[model samples]
Structures are given as C-alpha cells and as structure tokens.
Target: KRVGYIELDLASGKILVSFRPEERFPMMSTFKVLLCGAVLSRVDAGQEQLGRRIHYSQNDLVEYSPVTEKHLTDGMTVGELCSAAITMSDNTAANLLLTTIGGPKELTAFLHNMGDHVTRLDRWEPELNEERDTTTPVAMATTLRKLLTGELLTAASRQQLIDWMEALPAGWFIADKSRGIIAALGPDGKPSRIVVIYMTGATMDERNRQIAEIGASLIKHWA
Candidate 1:
C-alpha cells in the first residue's frame, strides 16, 4: 500500500480534508498542474497564444510519459498539450507546454506571483526523484485553489482547463466517474463528469481502494 495524503476543493477555496497534507511527497504526475497554470497565465497575458505549435525533440524532452511518443501528423497545438498535461498528466506534453510558454523558471515566477511560494520547478531531467521539480502537498492544493478561483488564466482559458479536466480518461483518481457513486454520466445523460482533487497514499491496496470509495462518496454528495 501507499501512504495517505489529503484533498482540497479548488472551487470553494477550502481544505476539504488534511491527512498529512502538509507532508512533502513526490508529486508524481500532479506537478503538471502547476506548470499548466503558469502557461495559462502567459496565454491570458497575450504574450503567448493557446493554439501555437511547439515542436518536441531532445531539447524539450524533460519528463517521462508514454504520451511523449506521440509522433505528429500535423503537430499538436499548445492547446492540446495543455489539456493533455492536466487530464492525462502527460510529461512530455507538459514539457512542451512549458517550453512554449518560455520555461520552468518563468513558470516558477508566475507561481510566485500567484502566492505559491512553496512550489519549485527544478532542472528538466527525465528522472522523477531528482533534486528539483519538487512541490509540497499544501502548494499543490494552493495551485488548484488558484486555478478554480479564476486567478490563473483568462475566463475562457480557465473554462478550457476545467473542461479538459472533466474530459480526462475514466478510472483515474482525479475523475471519480466510477466507484458506483457517479454513474459516469453528466447532466447530458452521458458519462457523468467533474474535475476533482484526489489524494491517497495508503500502505494497503484495500485502503487505497477505500480512499477512492471515499472520494466517490464525497463526489456523490458534494460534487
């Protein structure tokens, strides 16, 4: 089993729960959310365009995700990469998105401007447990809070980010569409959808599954 983490509600700007939420742990793929916010800020500022294409090679290669192998027939726009980074936690997609918006340093600056003092982006090494690119759980919650309050991206950009989140593939911790809580259909009578913050680091697989059940229960009532 893994350890136990916490969850925060970005929409209401509240710490929904905290079980070692302040404890620093490897962010895994969730770090992409931080970078996504930073890039969206640039697009909102008109300094960068959402649909801009960013070519990937060894230069832009930094993180690890199978999505990196996606060779393009027409190249992916910054918009798609942005979505991929959040929904799928795509690493290469995040790296490309970060490069298109400048770099992680600039993104770090942007995060600082948003009052995210604890978050840090280190060197672009393919390794996950490197010295840099680390963030705390509190900072992760803070980032999500900022994004939900419309403090990060433009109105349209923010909506798009959430839309991408809602569109994320099923059965992930972030999207509680199954678990028998959500019918996996939305108000449109299709697969229910919502972007949710999920955290769990239990030491037992059953406990981890229980965490997912708890999340689904919460989503059944709160979301």
Candidate 2:
C-alpha cells in the first residue's frame, strides 16, 4: 500500500505539507485533469474552442460514464466534453478530448512543458489498467496549483475548468477531494492553498474515505 499527500499554497505557490509526494501511483480517471488542461491550452491559444463540436461514435462509447451512456449517437462540444471528463469521470469524454488534443503523447508533452516531467500518459479510456496513466502526488497538485495561478491557461479557461470540477456530485470520489480544492481559495478569489491526497492498495471505499480525511484535515488547517 502507498499513501501520498501534498498541500500547496496557491497564494505563495509553496508546498505546506507533503508525505511521499514524490511517490508514483496510477491516477485512474484523475488523469482527465490533465486532459482538460491540454484541451484548454489549445483553447487559450485560439486553436480550439469550447463551443466547437466533437462527434460521438460507437468507438467513443464506454461503460460507467453517465454522461456518455445516453449520448452515444449524438455529438457534443468541447466544453461539454470537458465538463463530462472532470465532473463525471466519463471515460468516453476523456477519450474524445484525448483524441481531439492529439493523444496521450500530447497531454504528456503539455505536462512536461509545465514542469511535470515525471507524469506520463500512455493509454486512453478503455486501455486504462494498472500500468497506464501514472503521476506523483506532487505532480498532480502542482498541475492544479499552476492552473489556479493562471500559468497553465487563460483566466477564463482556468475558471471554466474549476467550474466544471465544481459541477461534480457532492459525494463522488474526486468531487469530495476537489471540493476541498475549491474551498481552499482565499479571500481575493484565489486559492491560498490546494491539496492532493492519493491513496491506493485499498478498496475503493477505503481509498475514498482516506482521501476525504486528508481533505478534511486541509480544510481544518488551511481553508
């Protein structure tokens, strides 16, 4: 079992607490955070549009994603796809964005340019398994912190990503920790700090509860 956590101050852009922040772990669907960033980077550069439509096909369909389950035959825009990727952890939506932005390599390049050199993306939705998408807790938290500091995307793009994250169900796994990310924002409407808590080698429910406790600790001390 591996457990890692990171707390970063978005105001000062400093790390507050980190236990095994450099330990690597499979990110599962959380890798979509980078996908959203990569797509929006193109949007910020005027190469992509949130309103631009992306068509759906049988190839794009996957299980466990409520957003894509019903829209198999219909197309969706980049904005909708981003929304689904983060808010619902929609595998199909993630694949669509990954395809649109190039592929796992493009997302990996984007993260490397942003200084997350260790994280890697080698698979898409249905291809996900134990050895595919991997990142360190520090890398994940740094990516989000950079997004908060407006370094990764335009201001509007950053807000849009956060807004999508905010739309997630209150008790969903990522939502529970991500809400703590949102709540860590400071009085000036910027996040004073952010936290990423990663735990694996446990049941899904146990992982969720552990991460939730980490989030609760952050809010109690930093938020």
Candidate 3:
C-alpha cells in the first residue's frame, strides 16, 4: 500500500489523469483485470474455445485468493473459467487460463502490445507466480485504461471483459465500492450521489479511500 498514481483513457486516445503514472505498484487483485484480456484474446482467436470443459480437482492449490480449490463442480466451460477468473479473481481459474493461453510470457507480451509496458504479468496464479510477475498501481491503471478504451483487446473481447468485470463478485474492496459509484451512472452514465475518494497509504482507511475513488470515477465513465 502506497500513494496511488493514475493513467486513464489512453485507449480512447485521451488522458484523464496522469501523475507519476509511469511508476509501478502492487496490483493486488487488479491483475485479474488484465487476465480478462488475455483470456478473451484466445477465445476470440479460436486459439481457445469458450464453453469448453475444465474439471477442478484436489490437485489444484487452494488459497485465500478469489479462486477456491474446494468443492468445485466438475467440467466447467472456458467461458465459465473466464467468469471465475475475473468475477472471483479465482487463482485456480486464472492459473488454468494462464496455462492455456501460453503462460506469463505471452500475457506480458499482450500487455506490451497494448502499449502497457508498466504492467507486467508473470503468472496467472498470483501466489504461485508472485515472484515472477509483478504489477504496480500505475501499471494497473494504465492497463485498465487501455482496456477501457478498447486498445488492449478487440471490440468484442473488450466488451466481454468489461461485462464480466462489471459483473464481478463483490468480495474485494474495489468491487464493493464500485457498486455504489456506478449506481449514479445508472444505465446512461449519470452523476451519482456517491462520493469518489482516491485512496493511498498503508493504513486500512487509506486503502478504502483509494478503492472508493477508483470505483466512483472509473465506473461512472465507461471511457
């Protein structure tokens, strides 16, 4: 937890915020945001087909991260995996997608191609690949910005990613805060009653503010 920097709207060929935006910071569950793009890319290219079956067993590692290893129903489709990866930030689903899409190397390459070099993805499963792949707050913002503007993934893929991201489970701070923020936007991006506050610092309060601001601002504007 540290001061947050924002890079927004590059994909729309615009810039809404920029301050030390090039610096890298820990992404926490934000990495799941980028993974959505990678997963969707493969789906669009036919390299991977959606609705394919993925069986979860005891062999998969269970962690506190969004993905759980216990009691997963057998043989889910690729679409379901993407849903789990982003909506739940599931480590097992993320790892499964990462492995299927060509690992961290390709994920990184995809980010770079999207003009998001700051955000580096090394692993699908955060804890397992934590040492190899790391993300910064600025990088996360930029990567997200790129996706928002449809530069990170194709139009179809981008929409799919955003739809899933918007539908993400409300377990994390960001998810919970975003829900309130988006309430104002309604179905047409109208101003909302929620106050947007950008959070920073190591303290719990600081982090809450950060999630609040990002949710308020980003969710309000689709760009």
Candidate 3 residue-wise lDDT, 1-223, digit = tens:
3344443433243445444444445455556667777777777777877877777666775564354464366656778767776676676777777777788788889888877766666544545333245455455654565565534467777667656755611322232221111111233221121121222335556456555555544432353
Clashing pairs in 2: none
What residue runs in model 3 are displaced by over 4 Å at the alpha carbon?
65-73, 124-132, 136-138, 150-152, 168-201, 209-223
lDDT for each candidate structure: 0.56, 0.72, 0.54
Query: Which digits, one per residue and each the tens of the lDDT, describe model 1 over residues 63-131?
Result: 455555574445577777777776666667876776665776877787788888876776543465443
Rank order (by lDDT, best first): 2, 1, 3
Candidate 1 RMSD to the real structure: 5.6
User: Which ranges of candidate 2 are over 4 A from the true structure?
Assistant: 168-190, 203-209, 219-223
Clashes of each: 15, 0, 7
Give the clashing residue pairs of candidate 3, or none. Answer: 25-136, 25-137, 67-90, 184-192, 197-213, 199-209, 199-210
Among these predictions, the greatest TM-score belongs to: 2
| Per-model RMSD to reference | 5.6, 3.8, 5.8
